[PDB]
Design an enzyme around this catalytic site. Structure first.
Site, PDB file in Angstrom:
ATOM      1  CG  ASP A 163       0.242  -2.757  -3.698  1.00  0.00           C
ATOM      2  OD1 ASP A 163      -0.809  -3.010  -3.020  1.00  0.00           O
ATOM      3  OD2 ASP A 163       0.267  -2.838  -4.951  1.00  0.00           O
ATOM      4  CG  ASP A 196      -4.317  -4.510  -1.050  1.00  0.00           C
ATOM      5  OD1 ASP A 196      -5.476  -4.990  -1.194  1.00  0.00           O
ATOM      6  OD2 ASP A 196      -3.789  -3.760  -1.901  1.00  0.00           O
TER       7      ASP A 196
END
Length: 205
Positions: free
Chosen positions: A170, A9
């Site tokens: 996350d 990400d």
């Protein structure tokens, strides 16, 4: 080796985020109900998912607050989110390229992408696209995590086998979806130095 592909990400993993600061900037330009607008339907989702273009989102946001906002104003408020662009994590990723296929899978908006594809993103002047074999960006695809469709488009387009891929995100819901699909996952905190832990995972047979 276990892992042939690694997917990152952007927000959280590579750029440490500060939502409070973006909330502060949004308030200062009249977006008063911002905190609830940005909480996990909604035009911020229309922005990430590509359903509304940048122009369309700002027009609607202006209507919503009863005040005209410019590109520059919203861009400036959204960029309040970006507390640190990790030079060292990009350096580390750059070291990974000859040994792995590297991908970005990110929920993101056109503003951050405008920043990321400029020579002002990193001290090196390197564009975001230059660290990955390919960038998978929600607003470019018309899809968004944690839906499976965005993972599946990525798989089809890249040819990555999930069981040969490490997914670093996350976002708990994003991780849960990658697990469901057969990925190796790692869930760092926003702002964690994960280089040592990832360097470890890659060692495994």
């Amino acid at each position: 080796a276990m892992i042939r592909n690694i997917v990152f990400d952007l927000g959280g993993v590579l750029i440490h985020l500060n939502r409070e600061e973006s909330i502060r900037r949004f308030k200062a330009i009249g977006v008063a109900d911002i905190e609830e607008m940005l909480d996990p339907k909604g035009l911020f989702l229309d922005l990430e998912s590509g359903r509304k273009s940048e122009e369309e989102f700002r027009t609607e946001l202006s209507r919503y607050i009863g005040k005209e906002l410019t590109y520059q104003q919203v861009y400036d408020a959204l960029l309040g989110f970006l507390e640190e662009i990790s030079a060292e994590k990009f350096d580390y990723i750059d070291s990974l390229r000859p040994d792995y296929r590297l991908f970005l899978l990110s929920n993101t908006n056109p503003y951050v992408l405008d920043l990321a594809m400029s020579p002002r993103f990193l001290p090196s002047g390197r564009t975001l696209d230059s660290f990955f074999d390919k960038v998978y960006a929600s607003c470019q695809m018309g899809k968004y995590k944690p839906n499976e469709d965005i993972f599946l488009e990525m798989i089809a387009d890249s040819g990555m086998k999930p069981e040969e891929t490490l997914f670093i995100d996350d976002g708990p819901a994003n991780v849960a979806t990658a697990e469901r699909l057969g990925f190796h996952t790692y869930c760092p905190d926003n702002g964690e130095n994960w280089i040592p832990a990832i360097t470890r995972l890659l060692r495994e047979q």
